């Protein structure tokens, strides 16, 4: 039996573009060799072009009578690690683009809650420490007047 | 000296085990799983093949009537037709004009080559796993064949190895299996004695050599045409051929975890899942007395370049001070970085280099040269190439060190916010306590 | 590129120079034969047509 020609591979980001040149109907099949495989098989007849996914687990494709060939993706991305805070997020978003967003959102809401609580504590403390002196026509104690920014800057 | 460890069930992974006897020099073993084989247990149910309808010649009774008789044959059919006036090449015999009777007989039989082209229906349960592990250390190589269950101890150069049961219990074969030539199908075949015409297992034989046969193909007979002798009949086509045409997929090209299915015997080889516990028992001659081994002091670790790629894309340097030159047993005590070698030549110069493979942006692991220790930290850049034809040589851990850049930024920001919060709490408490003190 | 338009190119019709990239790879001959096997990606001009 004859062995068909090897296809031309073009590497992408977790993808392989595959140029197929048959002379007579050959069988082309591939599977992703992870926990949940991506099954597919076909009877390629004319000159076609296929795009097939290659996760970090890897995959194998069987073209005609040739032996199966396995390809593994590599931990590559587009961000810049060990840079400014807006570049580490890009680096960890190119990899795993589903947990980085959730973690960033969680941290941002935690920071907002903390800063709002702190500002509320400051406002409440000022209200507590300013209202007893706001019920009598008394001096604001310029020593205390300078320290805390109350409503009357200099008027009593 | 009893020792235990757990090694991944990944073919080709360079697992290295570190053995520390307090009275002697450390030892490093290299174990590697060259090949596995997951053998299930089968119980043959029946055998299916194409059928062959045999039609004996009709019996035409001239000037008389014939009576049908029953027989014990698989899917037997017999009928008698009255009023036939057959013809032959020269002249029409059965000289009576209309007092004739034809008897038609047909029955199904197993094909001629059913012992060469047939499909088997099995039942698979309780798979048993096998392996072929290569163990090298010191100056002893050699590959051995083992059973992966805690009931087989093999001796390699005076050392006894027991490979414990697999961590998981996952088998790609379902309860019912159909095997044809060199292909395995996860199919739900009908039970023996209840096949259906036109589909898989229309005729079922308990064994390829069994005499008993159960055939169900809706064979029927029709009245012959006038002036002919042909025994008409109608029959639903073979179920085996139509199963061949539309069986659909397989298990060879559908199995998970990237493991090949084979036949004779059925087995799923090189199938990466789970962990393989290991138990050892080493003799006193494998270790070296501490007096013979060189002494290592002032061990400092610096990383020249790092790159979290599949290949060994990191370089590490160790500086020390030594009295005499010899050999040491390097090891990395965390699975973040996987070293390449298990021995290194120490010399009076005070410099040695090692290569590691990692998959994290910022690793943090402790490396030991003979009896010394040193902590290494580094910053690693991603690789430029998109796809490689070899499997990864790291343990695939991605969480960075707590002293890395990103986590340092998180620590600084959280510390600033916590300082603000503590200041707010202190101000509020001071105000309340001043109000209460009065 | 092999298999597509312009896998072989020439400056002009009568030009002596020629650039060809068709992925021509030789294979080991079978035992007891003299046939110099090879494999090659089909013509790009025909598939362009
Ligand atoms: C030679 O041919 C003659 C026909 O020309 C055959 O005679 C036929 O014989 C059969 C039985 O031997 C007859 O069938 C039955 O006969 C009984 C007689 O009472 C009748 O009651 C039934 O209703 C039925 O017809 C048939 O009638 C008869 N035909 C005739 C006489 O014309 C003869 O059998 C042939 N020779 C041999 C050796 O078979
Ligand atoms: C322990 O034993 C194994 C098996 O004997 C050793 O592996 C063997 O290493 C040699 C040296 O590289 C290999 O020979 C060469 O293999 C290449 C592979 O392409 C080939 O092109 C060369 O012509 C040459 O044959 C040999 O294949 C290899 N064996 C296997 C089964 O892979 C191993 O090196 C030994 N351990 C130590 C520490 O020496």
Numbering used by the authors:
A (entry chain I): 267 to 422
B (entry chain F): 1 to 438
C (entry chain G): 196 to 244
Reproduce passages from the article.
The Very Low-Density Lipoprotein Receptor (VLDLR) is an entry receptor for the prototypic alphavirus Semliki Forest Virus (SFV). The mature alphavirus virion is approximately 70 nanometers in diameter and has T = 4 icosahedral symmetry. Trimers of E1-E2 heterodimers are organized into 80 trimeric spikes on the virion surface. The LBD is comprised of eight cysteine-rich complement-type repeats, also known as LA domains (LA1 to LA8), which contribute to binding with SFV.
To elucidate the precise mechanism of SFV-VLDLR recognition, the single LA repeats (LA2-Fc, LA3-Fc, or LA5-Fc) in complex with the native SFV virion and SFV virion alone were firstly reconstructed by cryo-EM. To increase the resolution, a block-based reconstruction algorithm was applied, which improved the resolutions of SFV virion, SFV-LA3-Fc, and SFV-LA5-Fc to 3.02 Å, 3.45 Å, and 3.55 Å, respectively. In the structure of LA3-SFV, LA3 binds to the DIII domain of each E1 protein at both the 5’ and 2’ symmetry axis regions. What sets LA3 apart from LA5 is the length of the loop between the N-terminal strands which in LA3 is two residues longer than in LA5. We found that LA3 engages with the beta-sheet of E1-DIII through its EF-like motif, creating an interaction area of 323 Å2. The residues R114, E117, Q126, D135, E137, D139, and H116 on LA3 form hydrogen bonds and salt bridges with E1’s K347, K345, N325, E292, and D327. Meanwhile, LA3’s P129 and W132 engage in weak hydrophobic interactions with E1’s G326. As expected, most single mutations (E117A, P129S, W132A, D135A, E137A, and D139A) in LA3 resulted in a loss of SFV binding ability, while R114A and Q126A reduced the LA3 binding affinity to the virus. Analysis of the fully saturated LA-bound structures revealed that LA3 can bind independently at site-1-3 and site-1’-3’, satisfying the conditions for simultaneous binding at all six sites.
